[PDB]
Design an enzyme around this catalytic site. Structure first.
Site, short mmCIF file in Angstrom:
data_model
loop_
_atom_site.label_atom_id
_atom_site.label_comp_id
_atom_site.label_asym_id
_atom_site.label_seq_id
_atom_site.Cartn_x
_atom_site.Cartn_y
_atom_site.Cartn_z
N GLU A 53 37.67 63.20 27.73
CA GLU A 53 36.59 62.41 28.31
C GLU A 53 37.02 61.40 29.37
O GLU A 53 38.04 60.73 29.23
CB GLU A 53 35.82 61.71 27.19
CG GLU A 53 34.65 60.86 27.67
CD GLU A 53 33.73 60.49 26.52
OE1 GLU A 53 33.92 59.40 25.95
OE2 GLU A 53 32.85 61.31 26.18
N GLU A 213 33.46 63.78 17.21
CA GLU A 213 33.27 63.08 18.49
C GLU A 213 34.04 61.78 18.69
O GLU A 213 34.00 61.21 19.79
CB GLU A 213 31.79 62.79 18.72
CG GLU A 213 30.99 63.98 19.15
CD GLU A 213 29.57 63.60 19.51
OE1 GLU A 213 29.39 62.82 20.47
OE2 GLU A 213 28.64 64.07 18.83
N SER A 214 34.72 61.29 17.66
CA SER A 214 35.39 60.01 17.80
C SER A 214 36.59 59.85 16.88
O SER A 214 36.79 60.65 15.97
CB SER A 214 34.40 58.87 17.55
OG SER A 214 33.79 59.00 16.28
#
Ligand SMILES: Nc1ccc(F)cc1C(=O)O
Length: 257
Positions: A53, A213-214
């Site tokens: 990202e 996602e994290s």
């Protein structure tokens, strides 16, 4: 909530963009854009996919990196074996922009995820016009009827929705909406604080792609998610702050070897 404040800003920013670039214009731009890449095929490739990202800052982290050259960062991501590049385009809290999306799209061959707070149709055509292949939809941010509408429109343009959930109940809502890819955000967007992916992942139909996602700080975290059934992981903080993003991505891509 924190999420509420973000959405209020987003709705105003979207409205101002629409005043200068009409819905008709953005719809035409989307229709004229080269078709989106087959994101599902990418996600089904062997090995745990790394979604790398581009993110300059966040509510929780504050400033992370200047990223004067997001295209060059994304190129390093692809060189390291990233499966998809995520580009944050929210300006007020993350210091991202659609210009970052353009830069990245022109620089890499892998699919591109637009990471933002999608609340209205304009943003979907906007994403497509700017070359996004994948689009984030946040269950916490969207009433079910809106979520279903946003998901349908996303797929109608050939894009894949990354449907983000934080709870089992949100996962259930996502499935009902027709989600084919479900991401688990360990952070509560209302407050910014789980044990989430492991609790939620097992309950998903095998056919649905699972994304963590994290919280990926290194291979150990990636492997833990993989052991809990992740098909891919999204990684931002640890990559944008790296002096060697290509190597940092390669390390994650080859995790477990
Ligand atoms: N990384 C994030 C993803 C979504 C969000 F609403 C806030 C943050 C930040 O870390 O507070």
């Amino acid at each position: 909530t924190v999420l509420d404040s973000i959405l209020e800003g987003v709705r105003a920013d979207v409205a101002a963009r629409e005043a200068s670039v009409s819905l008709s214009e953005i719809k035409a731009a989307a229709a004229a854009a080269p078709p989106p890449l087959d994101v599902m095929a990418a996600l089904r490739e062997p090995g745990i996919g790394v979604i790398a990202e581009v993110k300059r800052a966040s509510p929780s982290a504050g400033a992370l990196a200047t990223i004067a050259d997001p295209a060059k960062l994304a190129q390093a991501y692809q060189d390291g074996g990233a499966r998809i590049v995520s580009v944050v385009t929210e300006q007020r809290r993350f210091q991202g922009s659609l210009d970052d999306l353009d830069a990245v799209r022109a620089s890499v061959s892998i699919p591109v995820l637009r990471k933002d707070f999608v609340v209205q149709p304009y943003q979907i055509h906007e994403a497509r016009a700017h070359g996004a292949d994948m689009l984030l939809l946040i269950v916490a941010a969207l009433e079910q009827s809106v979520l279903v509408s946003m998901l349908d429109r996303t797929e109608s343009l050939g894009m894949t929705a990354l449907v983000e959930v934080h709870t089992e109940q949100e996962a259930d809502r996502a499935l009902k909406a027709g989600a084919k890819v479900i991401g688990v955000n360990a952070r509560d967007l209302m407050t910014l604080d789980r044990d989430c992916f492991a609790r939620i992942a097992p309950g998903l139909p095998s056919s649905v792609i699972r994304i963590a996602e994290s919280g990926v700080r290194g291979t150990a975290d990636l492997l833990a998610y993989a052991g809990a059934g992740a098909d891919a992981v999204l990684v931002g903080e640890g990559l944008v702050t790296s002096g060697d993003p290509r190597a940092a991505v390669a390390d994650l891509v080859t995790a477990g070897t």
